[PDB]
Amino acid sequence: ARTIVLQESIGFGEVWRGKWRGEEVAVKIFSSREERSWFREAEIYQTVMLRHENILGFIAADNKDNGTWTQLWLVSDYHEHGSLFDYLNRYTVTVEGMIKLALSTASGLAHLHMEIVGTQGKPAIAHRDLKSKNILVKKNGTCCIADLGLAVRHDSATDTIDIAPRVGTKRYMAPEVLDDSINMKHFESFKRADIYAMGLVFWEIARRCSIGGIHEDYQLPYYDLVPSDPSVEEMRKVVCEQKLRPNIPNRWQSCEALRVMAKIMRECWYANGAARLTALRIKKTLSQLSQQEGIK
Numbered sequence: 001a002r003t004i005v006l007q008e009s010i011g012f013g014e015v016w017r018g019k020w021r022g023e024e025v026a027v028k029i030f031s032s033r034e035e036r037s038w039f040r041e042a043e044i045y046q047t048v049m050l051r052h053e054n055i056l057g058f059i060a061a062d063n064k065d066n067g068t069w070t071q072l073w074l075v076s077d078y079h080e081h082g083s084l085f086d087y088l089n090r091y092t093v094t095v096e097g098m099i100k101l102a103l104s105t106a107s108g109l110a111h112l113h114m115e116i117v118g119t120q121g122k123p124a125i126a127h128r129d130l131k132s133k134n135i136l137v138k139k140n141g142t143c144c145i146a147d148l149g150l151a152v153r154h155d156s157a158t159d160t161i162d163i164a165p166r167v168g169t170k171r172y173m174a175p176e177v178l179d180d181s182i183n184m185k186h187f188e189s190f191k192r193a194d195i196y197a198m199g200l201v202f203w204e205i206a207r208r209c210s211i212g213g214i215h216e217d218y219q220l221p222y223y224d225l226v227p228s229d230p231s232v233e234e235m236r237k238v239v240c241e242q243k244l245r246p247n248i249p250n251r252w253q254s255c256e257a258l259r260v261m262a263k264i265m266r267e268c269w270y271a272n273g274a275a276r277l278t279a280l281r282i283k284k285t286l287s288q289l290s291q292q293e294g295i296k
């Protein structure tokens, strides 16, 4: 923190583009009264064997005293494209482009979800706030997952969670979170809730897949059913009571890649978390799709 110069506001806490010896970094800055949120996110990022090409690259947790108040810093790799939300608003994608964004997101989530067993292993982690606004797009057109502050970690020996857990973004909350039926002592239930949210993100990507000049406008999931900044009650009435999901355009049946993406979405969107695909199964499916004749 001592040797980083903040240059530009780029969106708990606030995010800046900084320079460390002339190299661009991203800095999320918290106030003294946000220490618990800063510490918890620092803790998640310092998890043994967390580093992965599809998880935002951690550089440091640090303090900076400006002479009046102390700032709490989280420093990461800088990605010029910023959030998948901003990227999908600005650009359309090719079939290959769509699969790369979806596969890289699934690979990041499969890694978070995966317990790497050992005396020195990585615990399984559930994100609990996955959305297009906290996935970043790298220069190579792959995604990495950020904003890990609400994550929960699994102790597989006792089947317990490392903290005492409706915390995340209301629009992306799983049906079982919206109606508060989720078993918050059951780690597997948090993994299944992440899959529902990733299905919504896949729908946002697929809309922007342009074939023969044809694509949908960028929209958030449920743009057609709830107000901007929706309440838990507004979301619950649509997702749980009326049992609606984002609409699958008829266009997506014209293309094998979009057909497979649409099938993944419906198998992420079941009301019962136990019925949903795993991140690893989605990663396997999109890996196979990426190499298919007519796609590759």
Ligand SMILES: CC#CCn1cc(N(CC2CC2)c2nc(C(N)=O)c(-c3cc(C(=O)N(C)C)c[nH]3)s2)cn1
Binding pocket: 010, 011, 015, 017, 026, 027, 028, 045, 056, 057, 058, 059, 060, 074, 075, 076, 077, 078, 079, 080, 081, 082, 083, 086, 133, 134, 135, 136, 146, 147
């Ligand atoms: C460990 C750690 C850490 C730091 N950290 C940083 C974030 N967030 C916020 C985001 C996840 C919600 C971000 N990171 C980056 C980045 N890495 O380039 C962001 C970015 C925005 C733009 C951009 O929009 N423009 C226009 C340059 C370009 N890049 S926005 C969260 N935590």
